[PDB]
Design an enzyme around this catalytic site. Structure first.
Site, PDB file in Angstrom:
ATOM      1  N   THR A  21      -8.193  -6.218  -5.975  1.00  0.00           N
ATOM      2  CA  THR A  21      -6.820  -6.695  -5.873  1.00  0.00           C
ATOM      3  C   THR A  21      -5.835  -5.557  -5.680  1.00  0.00           C
ATOM      4  O   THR A  21      -5.980  -4.484  -6.261  1.00  0.00           O
ATOM      5  CB  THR A  21      -6.417  -7.508  -7.118  1.00  0.00           C
ATOM      6  OG1 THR A  21      -7.254  -8.660  -7.209  1.00  0.00           O
ATOM      7  CG2 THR A  21      -4.970  -7.964  -7.042  1.00  0.00           C
ATOM      8  N   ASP A  52      -2.560  -8.656  -1.784  1.00  0.00           N
ATOM      9  CA  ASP A  52      -3.633  -8.987  -0.867  1.00  0.00           C
ATOM     10  C   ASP A  52      -4.123 -10.400  -1.169  1.00  0.00           C
ATOM     11  O   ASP A  52      -3.665 -11.058  -2.107  1.00  0.00           O
ATOM     12  CB  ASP A  52      -4.760  -7.966  -0.971  1.00  0.00           C
ATOM     13  CG  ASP A  52      -5.540  -8.096  -2.259  1.00  0.00           C
ATOM     14  OD1 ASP A  52      -4.913  -8.106  -3.337  1.00  0.00           O
ATOM     15  OD2 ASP A  52      -6.781  -8.207  -2.196  1.00  0.00           O
ATOM     16  N   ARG A  65      -7.488 -11.370  -1.414  1.00  0.00           N
ATOM     17  CA  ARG A  65      -8.962 -11.308  -1.581  1.00  0.00           C
ATOM     18  C   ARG A  65      -9.370 -11.454  -3.046  1.00  0.00           C
ATOM     19  O   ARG A  65      -9.087 -10.535  -3.837  1.00  0.00           O
ATOM     20  CB  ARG A  65      -9.571  -9.994  -1.091  1.00  0.00           C
ATOM     21  CG  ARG A  65     -11.063  -9.881  -1.363  1.00  0.00           C
ATOM     22  CD  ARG A  65     -11.625  -8.527  -0.989  1.00  0.00           C
ATOM     23  NE  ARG A  65     -11.903  -8.434   0.447  1.00  0.00           N
ATOM     24  CZ  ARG A  65     -12.650  -7.486   0.985  1.00  0.00           C
ATOM     25  NH1 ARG A  65     -12.498  -6.237   0.598  1.00  0.00           N
ATOM     26  NH2 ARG A  65     -13.552  -7.786   1.898  1.00  0.00           N
ATOM     27  N   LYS A 102      -2.070 -14.536  -4.891  1.00  0.00           N
ATOM     28  CA  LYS A 102      -1.840 -13.711  -6.066  1.00  0.00           C
ATOM     29  C   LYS A 102      -0.363 -13.552  -6.391  1.00  0.00           C
ATOM     30  O   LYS A 102      -0.032 -12.922  -7.398  1.00  0.00           O
ATOM     31  CB  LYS A 102      -2.485 -12.335  -5.879  1.00  0.00           C
ATOM     32  CG  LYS A 102      -3.943 -12.407  -5.480  1.00  0.00           C
ATOM     33  CD  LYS A 102      -4.525 -11.032  -5.237  1.00  0.00           C
ATOM     34  CE  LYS A 102      -5.895 -11.135  -4.599  1.00  0.00           C
ATOM     35  NZ  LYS A 102      -6.572  -9.818  -4.517  1.00  0.00           N
ATOM     36  N   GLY A 160      -6.349  -8.761 -12.116  1.00  0.00           N
ATOM     37  CA  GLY A 160      -7.221  -8.950 -13.264  1.00  0.00           C
ATOM     38  C   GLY A 160      -8.096 -10.180 -13.082  1.00  0.00           C
ATOM     39  O   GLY A 160      -8.759 -10.324 -12.068  1.00  0.00           O
ATOM     40  N   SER A 165      -7.190  -3.269  -8.386  1.00  0.00           N
ATOM     41  CA  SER A 165      -8.176  -2.244  -8.055  1.00  0.00           C
ATOM     42  C   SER A 165      -7.636  -1.265  -7.019  1.00  0.00           C
ATOM     43  O   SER A 165      -7.869  -0.054  -7.120  1.00  0.00           O
ATOM     44  CB  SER A 165      -9.465  -2.897  -7.561  1.00  0.00           C
ATOM     45  OG  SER A 165      -9.216  -3.735  -6.447  1.00  0.00           O
ATOM     46  N   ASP A 195      -9.612  -0.002  -0.767  1.00  0.00           N
ATOM     47  CA  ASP A 195     -10.280  -0.624  -1.901  1.00  0.00           C
ATOM     48  C   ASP A 195     -11.148  -1.782  -1.426  1.00  0.00           C
ATOM     49  O   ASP A 195     -10.717  -2.589  -0.596  1.00  0.00           O
ATOM     50  CB  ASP A 195      -9.267  -1.114  -2.934  1.00  0.00           C
ATOM     51  CG  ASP A 195      -9.905  -1.447  -4.258  1.00  0.00           C
ATOM     52  OD1 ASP A 195     -10.258  -0.511  -5.004  1.00  0.00           O
ATOM     53  OD2 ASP A 195     -10.064  -2.650  -4.548  1.00  0.00           O
ATOM     54  N   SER A 249      -9.951  -5.274  -2.636  1.00  0.00           N
ATOM     55  CA  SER A 249      -8.804  -5.790  -1.908  1.00  0.00           C
ATOM     56  C   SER A 249      -9.148  -5.967  -0.437  1.00  0.00           C
ATOM     57  O   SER A 249      -9.973  -5.235   0.117  1.00  0.00           O
ATOM     58  CB  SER A 249      -7.605  -4.852  -2.038  1.00  0.00           C
ATOM     59  OG  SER A 249      -7.440  -4.418  -3.374  1.00  0.00           O
TER      60      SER A 249
HETATM   61  C1  SA1 Z   1      -8.073  -8.678  -8.402  1.00  0.00           C
HETATM   62  O1  SA1 Z   1      -7.788  -7.948  -9.337  1.00  0.00           O
HETATM   63  C2  SA1 Z   1      -9.295  -9.562  -8.447  1.00  0.00           C
HETATM   64  C3  SA1 Z   1      -8.970 -10.894  -7.756  1.00  0.00           C
HETATM   65  O2  SA1 Z   1      -9.981 -11.859  -8.069  1.00  0.00           O
HETATM   66  C4  SA1 Z   1      -7.610 -11.477  -8.161  1.00  0.00           C
HETATM   67  C5  SA1 Z   1      -7.456 -11.740  -9.640  1.00  0.00           C
HETATM   68  C6  SA1 Z   1      -6.222 -12.031 -10.039  1.00  0.00           C
HETATM   69  C7  SA1 Z   1      -5.354 -12.747  -9.033  1.00  0.00           C
HETATM   70  C8  SA1 Z   1      -6.284 -13.625  -8.206  1.00  0.00           C
HETATM   71  C9  SA1 Z   1      -7.274 -12.770  -7.415  1.00  0.00           C
HETATM   72  N1  SA1 Z   1      -9.822  -9.780  -9.779  1.00  0.00           N
HETATM   73  C10 SA1 Z   1     -11.144  -9.698  -9.848  1.00  0.00           C
HETATM   74  O3  SA1 Z   1     -11.842 -10.031 -10.790  1.00  0.00           O
HETATM   75  C11 SA1 Z   1     -11.677  -9.114  -8.584  1.00  0.00           C
HETATM   76  C12 SA1 Z   1     -12.331  -7.767  -8.818  1.00  0.00           C
HETATM   77  C13 SA1 Z   1     -11.609  -6.881  -7.815  1.00  0.00           C
HETATM   78  O4  SA1 Z   1     -10.287  -7.412  -7.874  1.00  0.00           O
HETATM   79  C14 SA1 Z   1     -10.435  -8.823  -7.766  1.00  0.00           C
HETATM   80  C15 SA1 Z   1     -10.599  -9.208  -6.302  1.00  0.00           C
END
Ligand code: SA1
Lengths: 225, 234, 208, 203, 230, 230, 212, 230, 239
Positions: free
Chosen positions: H1, H17, H19, H33, H47, H129, H166, H169
């Protein structure tokens, strides 16, 4: 009469009529007498015998080693208060390791009785306690009232026919401070005799060094003269 | 007034006095203490012959050594004897000894006056039952009397129920401190028969002895009740 | 049980006139000398001083509890303080309560006071709640770096007990990392609590 | 520990060692591992000593409470059920109760193996303890239904003796109890030291 | 919670609320429980609109496979009593594995009623219950009558509800010390009929045989026994 | 007169709290206690009309410790008086627990008036028939809480029987101009002038919080002023 | 974190025909350090019995306070001092009340029963009760137990009658065993508190022991 | 993220992003997000997706209830305090690393709120991330009082930096521009413009796909049944 | 259950909460009148400070209280109820600042006090708190002054000018008949004190009135010292 509904209701005169009824319930108990010398304190009382062949209901109780209480009124409420006082003595001998002062016990029992009279659904304890203690505070006598207050006395009489005992104590009030243990016990028994309507009279005597002890029946014969 | 824990202008708990009256409405029961034992003689009121007498037992064995006879409300007395039995077994469990007669009497009495009303969640009214607690403690029979007020008194002889006052009056000149257990049974049954409104019979009476020699509170069987009623002067 | 902001060693010893307690006025954060001129003893009553070696946060919490209870009993008794025995008993019961709750006060707490009867009372309660009354109590390295320097002079003259405690705290300053600064001396006598001037108890540095 | 109890035609023989030992040290050799519960019921103590003693005296309290509340005495199945329910309520608290509720009730002889874990197994032959395997071997090899009272008591005594010999956790004296319709009978406490035959050279 | 001590003593010593609960019982349908050496029988009269309602709502209930239960009084207070009694039978099985003693379960129901007489903010059960059944631990059929006061008494033959005094007189007159099972059936049926002017279409009769469960009498056998009694 | 006087939380159609007024009547019945703020400290003097000559000389306090700096004169229902004294001690202890410092008489009075007000604000409580005068030299505060929960700081407070005349007499002196030791004779003269002849034996329970006491509450020593009178 | 200090120290109880002799070392010590050279561990519970606790001193003090509380409650509610057998049952139940947070103390309840006979009861931390003629508890329990076994032979021959050892001989046996333990157990040391319960009541003696 | 909110002269630009990865696998390629909190406040969160979605919905509900009852515009520091308190009371177990971005009377405010409840007012923030790859752009291209378009491009380029650098992301850059409807009027209505897929990186799209999809799996149907949709 | 409609806070046969109206009369029993005037540049609240006995320390005889630094409260009613309301409004403000993170607005504090007075007017075991509350201050989000009155019924409103106490009807009448969009804080203060003085029918001194004049400059709550109160009173005695 119309305001004699709860212990929580004040009459237009500022009187809690249920509290006064409990106080009268104390005044209907058997004659209780308390005395206090500079070295010893005494509580005595003509125990009540409901039936001819029934024993005299115990009236003097030992709260702690140097603390005792003579109940006047509902003996069941007296036993409940004795349980509460013994718990307080056991939590003061647990928290601090020494014996609580009878003044503190009087404070606690007065607080409990007042909380009974201040919250609805509770009744004032229908028992008045003549508590004698001895300790760093010296010998001390407290007459705890149902209303939630304790009066410290050098001498005191409660229950029925207690006016004669009170008169005797007033006559001999100035003698009590110097009266020995035996003389204080004699004064107690001779204040009760004025209330006579012995095997009925039970007397708990405590001293600054002497632990509280209960004498009943023939044990008190030596103190009559 | 109008609340259970109210004091009359005379200084009496009105519910307590009314529970005393309820006891005075209960079946008669005479407890006679003698150095050999404590003997209960209880009027079993049988509204019909179909009523199983053993099931309206006004005598309850609190423990091996201590027993109890009720007067007044049989259900409140059941609660009291249940508490006493739990107390006796708890005492045996906690101190490896039979509970003292005075001790269990005081426990049930403390339970008696714990009634209350008006406070958020306890019993709501005093026990309408007076108990004649008796048993053998340290090779001695002790007889105690509990009334709804929660006061208990040790008794050499006592009566509870409808004939309580008349039974006490009859016991005035009939009870002595040195009677034999034979004489104690005779006196208890005589006083009961005098203060009941039906002819005494083994089936309408319940007799029980806290016997020092056996050190146990036993309840007499029909044969023993007949053995006592036969000896009576009438 | 964890010690972070720790009060250093304490050596208390009864002498003829009372109890003499010594301890540095330094609280150490781990090994760092973090706070100076911080007395490890708190006068909870005119004739009752309370010190503690170990976490000083747990000794400030214990002193809060002690002062609250003394205030309760003082209000009840119209000014009369709890006795040294009563205060130590409450500390013993509250520190055992904390240990029993699994949140022990990580401080060995010395209660030194004169009971109203005039008998010196020196007792110690460890973090676990084990309490003991003794004529001389060392806590921290004051217990370890002691030897017979206190026991031989305990209950003796003030000069002898002071010299013994000074020897023990010279050993402490020499061989305790958390020993920093002057060593305050407090005399709890039936005439009150007197904070004698803090003394720099120098180790013998001609060793080099 | 080693406790055994078996039902033969004449009643229930319950023999128990008397050793309490933790680790290596023998804390006692006079431990009473048979606690009476009713006039014709007992409960054996195996595993945790404090747990077995507290819960067997608590079961005795409950049995007495039930007998006074209700004229009919609490049966051996009902008593073992009370005990097993109470012990199961403390599952995960690391209680250690091994206990054979051996009694004669209206339905005859009854042995119920009760454990801290809550297991309540009815049976005619049980052995609980570190040396219980040895007592089981002696029982199952020498047990008969038609043994006299003396023969059954000696069988239980010898099984406990062999368990004490082969197990460090078992020792002391065999407390033998015979439970019959009439009631619990305490046969004798026999020192296993006297039971050992020193004329034998194999053990 | 609410604690208004509904049940309090009166100056004469009576719990007026218990008197009112007894009145509620006495306005309930008549129940007659009789016993033999080996079989217990319960006969409850039923007031209903035969053309417009199902007679399957029974006053007789089964607390357990060995505990039969009938009631007179408020049907809701009785439903609560029966529900608690069934729960207690199953809890006694859980705690002991033995079938709950008929005396034990009757004591439990009487203690429920008593607690309602003792608990503040609790209205005494306006129900008198006939807890009948068989104990293997005693080898005796039992019939206890628990009252709203919380008092329970075993009876050889007991009746509750409306007309309870007339049916009690009938039971006292026509009771035999050693009745057979069919004699117990005849006694219960005749005692109920003494106050009922209708046959099988009104009466409801159940029974429990030694070591047996509760069986509801058919509308054919019941009528045959009614005619035989007459 | 009307029925608005039974429930403490009930308001009279004139907005009067009749139960609070009766608590105030209970206060007015009691013998007057007063407090005066002076240069060197605050002096609390309570008139004790000894009902019996057997009462301990100097016992049965009306002035109480609340804190090592706060004293509490009490007027009115002595059970309520000591209940409020202990509740003030508990409030001070809780204040120290929450905030570390020792409470001040203004906010102590606010916290205890909270209980006073709750007594007649929520049902199931009785209004405190006591007026409590909290004095503290270290806070230079003399706050009297009334049965309603109304609390005011005073230069010279007084409550009880003849409280109006006692306040009128306290008004005649600028108490802050003088110290406690010279205030004691003046207050004693005030109470003796207002002391009723009917009460033969009595006492003047004086306490002071001053520099001579280091701000700690202390009963005025007998040598300074013998509290006992005939 | 372990809530116990595992304090060492030995207590040796010997029940007699009409006496009970419990001798426990005063020393309070754990982890090579002596917190208190004198710290009495035998306490006169009432006029019928005495309790000797060895182990965690916080738990010794807490359990002794609880036992004094329970005995005072028994005296108040049952109108006589709790008997040695009743005190023994109460000790068992009190220790077991903390079965899951045990008092890490081994208890010897020694007293004189209503019959006048000596009654010693040994305990483990979790409340096992055992009516014993003799027992040893604490750090030197393993050391002292063979001493008592030799003095009496009860472990060697369980079923034989316990020898009629006089009161003074039992006191000497406890003294000698405590001295041997002090010589061998580091935790045992300082002063021996030799308490004796007899018909005459509770007597106490203080004998020096090797401090080292 | 990769989530990044910055404050430009006229408002706030939040970006994220799209993803969501279920481990090493891209579960969602259009994940939202950026969570609407109130008309003036948007939170972009990283998260745990469930934790972020639920906490943002809960705080949006809290502030909608606030704006309804009180008629007051939710404050960015108010939203941040609520979020931080909620995340602290869950001791970081709600893994919602949030970036609150709004405009209240105090102007445009961007706050970070760590999963453990640690918040901070910062001009530009990047979490997730790719938070470092984003913050680099934010560190190099953010300046005081930048116009809306430059901040939009900077936040989109920071989200794109997180996307490319990343692995956690990727996919598109969703923006949300909180701004006052009349920038010259500081009291004008705070509106938001959400630019879904503001950046759609062409080099990050599916560049190949079998036009004739090759499949050699044959479906054998054991049983078929058709049921109406009503 | 009939008859509780006059002694408890339940509706009467005519649908009135008699206890609420009696709490209004208990507010009247305060023997004190408050007048608050709100203007674009300031909010001035003047409440007569009638100290019955001069033995009382006047600094404690206050009807104006600091709920927060920005929000003041002029509370007219039973002094015990007034202290309960100051402690309950301060508790509301602290809980709001702990949760929302910013000082409570006057509007939200008025809403919370209204909710409490509704729980008093509904829960029959709670007395209607006999306090007419004038909450006032400068709301930051609007940077404009808020002036709310919450009656013992809980009936809360925002006011350009409000009044409480014995002369509440007459003071409100005078306010509405003479309200203006004042252009200065001192004209708001003059109107406030003039209306209060006229309705109370007695000349005021700074000793006899607590005045809090929250301006855009001095937004934080504070009772004006006697100097400024006397200056405003002289300005009001000019005409
Ligand atoms: C981002 O941190 C991420 C996404 O799933 C994100 C989570 C919070 C908002 C919705 C989408 N969280 C995760 O567990 C994965 C790991 C890498 O970052 C994610 C894509």
């Amino acid at each position: 009469s119309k305001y004699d509904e709860n212990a929580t209701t004040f009459s237009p005169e500022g009187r809690i009529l249920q509290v006064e009824n409990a106080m009268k319930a104390v005044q209907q108990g058997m004659p209780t007498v308390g005395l206090k010398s500079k070295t010893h304190a005494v509580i005595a009382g003509v125990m009540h015998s409901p039936s001819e062949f029934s024993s005299h209901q115990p009236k003097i109780f030992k709260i702690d080693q140097h603390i005792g209480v003579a109940i006047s009124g509902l003996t069941a409420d007296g036993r409940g208060l004795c349980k509460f006082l013994r718990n307080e003595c056991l939590h003061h001998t647990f928290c601090f390791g020494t014996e609580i002062r009878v003044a503190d016990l009087a404070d606690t029992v007065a607080l409990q009785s007042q909380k009974k009279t201040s919250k609805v659904g509770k009744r004032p304890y229908g028992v008045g306690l003549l508590m004698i203690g001895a300790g760093v505070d010296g010998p001390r006598l407290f007459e705890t009232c149902p209303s939630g207050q304790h009066w410290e006395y050098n001498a005191q009489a409660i229950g029925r026919r207690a006016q004669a005992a009170k008169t005797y104590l007033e006559t001999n009030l100035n003698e009590f401070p110097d009266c020995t243990r035996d003389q204080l016990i004699r004064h107690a028994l001779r204040a009760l005799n004025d209330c006579k309507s012995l095997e009925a009279i039970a007397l708990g005597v405590v001293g600054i060094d002497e632990p509280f002890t209960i004498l009943e029946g023939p044990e008190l014969q030596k103190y009559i003269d | 007034d109008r609340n259970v824990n109210t004091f009359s202008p005379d200084g009496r708990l009105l519910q307590v006095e009314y529970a005393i009256e309820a006891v005075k409405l209960g079946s008669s029961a005479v407890a006679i203490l003698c150095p050999e034992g404590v003997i209960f003689a209880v009027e079993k009121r049988l509204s019909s012959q179909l009523l199983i007498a053993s099931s309206v037992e006004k005598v309850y064995a609190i423990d091996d050594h201590v027993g109890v006879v009720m007067a007044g409300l049989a259900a409140d007395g059941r609660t009291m004897v249940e508490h006493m039995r739990v107390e006796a077994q708890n005492h045996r469990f906690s101190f490896d000894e039979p509970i003292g007669i005075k001790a269990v009497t005081q426990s049930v009495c403390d339970l008696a006056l714990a009634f209350g009303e008006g406070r958020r969640k306890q019993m709501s009214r005093p026990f309408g039952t007076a108990l004649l607690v008796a048993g053998i403690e340290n090779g001695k029979c002790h007889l105690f009397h509990t009334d709804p007020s929660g006061t208990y008194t040790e008794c050499r002889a006592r009566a509870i129920g409808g004939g309580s006052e008349g039974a006490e009056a009859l016991l005035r000149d009939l009870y002595k401190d040195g009677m034999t257990l034979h004489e104690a049974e005779d006196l208890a049954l005589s006083t009961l028969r005098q203060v009941i409104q039906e002819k005494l019979n083994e089936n309408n009476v319940e007799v029980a002895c806290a016997r020092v020699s056996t050190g146990k509170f036993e309840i007499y069987t029909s044969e023993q009740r007949q053995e006592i009623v036969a000896r009576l002067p009438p | 049980m964890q010690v972070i902001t720790a009060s250093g060693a304490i050596v208390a010893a009864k002498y003829d006139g009372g109890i003499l307690l010594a301890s540095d006025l330094s609280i150490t954060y781990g090994s760092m000398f973090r706070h100076n001129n911080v007395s490890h003893f708190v006068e909870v009553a005119p004739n009752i001083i309370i010190g503690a070696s170990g976490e000083f946060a747990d000794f400030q919490t214990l002193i809060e509890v002690i002062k609250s209870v003394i205030l309760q009993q003082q209000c009840k008794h119209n000014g009369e303080y709890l006795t040294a025995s009563e205060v130590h008993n409450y500390i013993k019961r509250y520190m055992y309560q904390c240990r029993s709750n699994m949140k022990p006060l990580s401080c060995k707490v010395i209660v030194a006071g004169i009971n109203p009867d005039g008998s010196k009372f020196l007792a110690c309660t460890d973090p676990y709640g084990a309490s003991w009354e003794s004529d001389h109590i060392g806590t921290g390295f004051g217990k370890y770096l002691q030897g017979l320097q206190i026991a031989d002079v305990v209950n003796g003259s003030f000069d002898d007990v002071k010299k013994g405690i000074t020897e023990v705290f010279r050993a402490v300053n020499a061989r305790n990392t958390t020993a920093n600064g002057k060593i305050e001396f407090i005399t709890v006598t039936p005439q009150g609590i007197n904070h004698l001037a803090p003394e720099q108890i120098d180790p013998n540095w001609e060793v080099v | 520990t080693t406790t055994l109890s078996f039902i033969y035609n004449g009643g229930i023989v319950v023999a128990v060692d008397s050793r309490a030992t933790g680790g290596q040290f023998i804390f006692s050799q006079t431990v009473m591992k048979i606690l009476p519960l009713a006039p014709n019921m007992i409960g054996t103590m195996a595993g945790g000593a404090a747990d077995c003693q507290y819960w067997l005296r608590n079961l005795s309290r409950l049995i007495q409470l039930h007998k006074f509340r209700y004229q009919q005495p609490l049966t051996v199945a009902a008593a073992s059920k009370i005990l097993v329910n109470e012990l199961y309520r403390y599952k995960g608290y690391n209680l250690s109760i091994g206990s054979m509720i051996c009694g004669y009730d209206n339905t005859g002889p009854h042995i119920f193996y009760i454990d801290n874990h809550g297991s309540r197994i009815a049976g005619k032959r049980f052995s609980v303890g570190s040396g219980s395997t040895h007592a089981y071997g002696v029982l199952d090899t020498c047990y008969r239904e038609d043994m006299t009272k003396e023969e059954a008591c000696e069988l239980g005594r010898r099984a406990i003796y062999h368990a004490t010999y082969r197990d460090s956790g078992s020792g002391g004296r065999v407390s033998v109890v015979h439970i019959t319709q009439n009631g619990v009978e305490w046969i004798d406490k026999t020192d296993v030291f006297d039971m050992h035959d020193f004329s034998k050279t194999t053990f | 919670d609410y604690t208004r001590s509904i049940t309090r003593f009166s100056p004469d010593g009576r719990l007026f609320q218990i008197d009112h609960a007894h009145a509620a019982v006495q306005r309930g349908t008549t129940v007659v429980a009789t016993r033999s050496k080996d079989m217990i029988v319960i006969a409850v009269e039923k007031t209903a609109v035969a053309k417009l309602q199902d007679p399957h709502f029974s006053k007789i209930c089964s607390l357990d496979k060995h505990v039969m239960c009938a009631f007179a009084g408020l049907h809701a207070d009785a439903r609560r009593l029966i529900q608690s009694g069934q729960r207690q039978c199953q809890s006694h099985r859980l705690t002991y594995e033995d079938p709950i003693s008929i005396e034990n379960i009757a004591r439990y129901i009487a203690t429920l009623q008593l607690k309602n007489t003792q608990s503040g903010g609790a209205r005494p059960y306006g129900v008198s219950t006939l807890i009948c059944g068989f104990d293997d631990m005693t080898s005796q059929p039992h019939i206890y009558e628990t009252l709203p006061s919380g008092t329970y008494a075993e009876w050889k033959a007991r009746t509750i509800g409306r007309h309870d005094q007339t049916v009690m007189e009938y039971l006292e007159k026509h009771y035999k010390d050693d009745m057979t099972d069919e004699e117990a059936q005849k006694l219960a049926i005749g005692a109920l009929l003494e106050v009922v002017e209708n046959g099988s279409k009104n009466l409801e009769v159940a029974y429990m045989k030694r070591g047996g469960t509760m069986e509801i009498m058919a509308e054919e056998v019941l009528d045959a026994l009614i005619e035989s009694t007459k | 007169g009307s029925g608005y006087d039974f429930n403490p939380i009930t308001f009279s159609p004139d907005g009067r709290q009749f139960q609070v007024e009766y608590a105030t009547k209970a206060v007015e019945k009691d013998s007057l206690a007063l407090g005066v703020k002076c240069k060197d400290g605050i002096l609390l003097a309570a008139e004790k009309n000894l009902t019996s000559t057997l009462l301990t000389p100097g016992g049965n306090p009306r002035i109480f410790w609340i804190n090592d700096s706060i004293a509490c004169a009490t007027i009115g229902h002595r059970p309520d008086c000591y209940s409020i004294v202990e509740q003030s001690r508990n409030r001070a202890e809780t204040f120290t627990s929450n905030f570390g410092i020792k409470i001040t008489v203004p906010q102590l009075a606010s916290e205890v008036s909270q209980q006073f007000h709750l007594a007649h604000y929520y049902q199931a409580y009785r209004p405190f028939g006591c007026t409590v005068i909290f004095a503290s030299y270290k806070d230079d505060a003399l706050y009297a809480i009334e049965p309603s929960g109304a609390f005011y700081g005073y230069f010279a407070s007084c409550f009880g029987k003849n409280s109006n005349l006692a306040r009128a007499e306290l008004q005649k002196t600028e108490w802050k101009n003088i110290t406690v030791r010279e205030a004691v004779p003046e207050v004693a003269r005030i109470i003796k002038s207002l002391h009723e002849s009917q009460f033969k034996k009595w006492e003047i329970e004086m306490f002071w919080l001053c520099e001579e006491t280091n701000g700690r509450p202390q009963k005025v020593p007998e040598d300074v002023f013998q509290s006992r009178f005939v | 974190w372990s809530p116990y200090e595992m304090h060492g120290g030995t207590a040796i109880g010997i029940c007699g025909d009409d006496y009970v002799v419990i001798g426990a070392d005063t020393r309070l010590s754990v982890d090579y350090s002596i917190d208190s050279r004198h710290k009495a561990r035998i306490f006169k519970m009432n006029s019928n019995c005495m309790i000797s606790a060895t182990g965690f001193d916080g738990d010794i003090d807490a359990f002794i306070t609880r036992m004094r509380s329970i005995l005072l409650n028994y005296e108040n509610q049952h109108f006589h001092e709790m008997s040695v057998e009743s005190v023994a049952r109460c000790v068992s139940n009190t220790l077991y009340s903390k079965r899951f947070f045990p008092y890490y103390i081994n208890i010897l309840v020694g007293g004189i029963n209503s019959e006048g006979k000596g009654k010693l009861y040994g305990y483990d931390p979790v409340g096992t009760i055992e009516d014993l003629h003799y027992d040893s508890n604490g750090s030197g329990s393993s050391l002292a137990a063979p001493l008592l076994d030799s003095a009496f032979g009860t472990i060697h021959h369980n079923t034989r009658p316990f020898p009629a050892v006089s009161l003074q001989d039992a006191k000497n046996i406890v003294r000698d065993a405590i001295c041997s333990v002090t010589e061998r157990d580091i935790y045992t040391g300082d002063a021996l508190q030799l308490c004796v319960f007899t018909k005459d009541g509770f007597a106490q003696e203080e004998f020096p022991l090797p401090r080292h | 993220t990769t989530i990044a909110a910055a404050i430009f002269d006229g408002g706030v630009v939040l970006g994220a992003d799209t993803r969501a990865t279920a481990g090493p696998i891209v579960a969602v390629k259009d994940e939202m997000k950026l969570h609407y909190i109130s008309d003036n406040i948007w939170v972009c969160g990283a998260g745990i997706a469930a934790d972020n979605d639920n906490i943002n919905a809960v705080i949006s509900a809290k502030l909608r209830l606030f704006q309804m009852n009180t008629g007051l515009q939710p404050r960015v520091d108010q939203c941040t305090n609520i979020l931080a308190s909620r995340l602290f009371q869950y001791m970081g177990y709600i893994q919602a690393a949030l970036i609150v971005g709004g405009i209240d009377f105090q102007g445009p405010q961007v706050y970070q709120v760590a999963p453990h409840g640690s918040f901070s007012k910062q001009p530009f923030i990047a979490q997730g991330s790719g938070s470092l790859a984003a913050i680099s752009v934010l560190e190099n291209r953010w300046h005081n009082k930048m116009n809306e378009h430059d901040c939009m491009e900077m936040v989109a380029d920071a989200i794109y930096a997180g996307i490319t650098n990343d692995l956690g992301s990727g996919s598109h850059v969703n923006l949300c521009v909180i701004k006052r409807e009349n920038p010259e009027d500081k009291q004008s209505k705070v509106i938001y413009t959400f630019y879904k897929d503001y950046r759609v990186p062409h080099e990050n799209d599916r560049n190949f796909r079998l036009e004739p999809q090759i499949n050699n799996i044959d479906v054998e149907v054991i049983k078929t049944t058709e049921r109406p949709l009503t | 259950s009939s008859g509780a409609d006059r002694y408890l806070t339940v509706f009467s046969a005519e649908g009135r909460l008699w206890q609420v109206e009696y709490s209004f009369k208990a507010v009247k029993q305060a023997e004190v009148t408050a007048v608050a005037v709100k203007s674009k540049n300031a909010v001035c609240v003047a409440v007569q400070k009638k100290v019955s006995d001069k033995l009382i320390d006047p600094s404690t005889v206050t009807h104006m209280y600091r709920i927060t630094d920005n929000v003041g409260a002029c509370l007219v009613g039973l002094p015990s109820d007034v202290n309960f309301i100051v402690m309950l409004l301060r508790s509301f403000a602290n809980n709001f600042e702990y949760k929302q993170g910013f000082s409570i607005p006057v509007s939200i504090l008025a809403q919370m006090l209204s909710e409490r007075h509704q729980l008093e007017s509904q829960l029959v075991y709670v007395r209607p708190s006999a306090v007419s509350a004038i909450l006032f201050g400068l709301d930051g989000p609007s940077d404009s002054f808020a002036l709310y009155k919450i009656e013992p019924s809980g009936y809360s409103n925002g006011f350009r000018a409000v009044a409480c106490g014995v002369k509440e009807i007459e003071a409100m009448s005078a306010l509405e008949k003479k309200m203006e969009d004042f252009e200065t804080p001192e004209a708001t203060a003059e109107f406030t004190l003039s209306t209060l003085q006229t309705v109370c029918g007695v000349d005021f001194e700074a000793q006899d009135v607590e005045v809090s004049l929250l301006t855009r400059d001095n937004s934080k709550f504070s009772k004006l010292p006697n100097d400024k109160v006397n200056e405003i009173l002289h300005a009001v005695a000019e005409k």
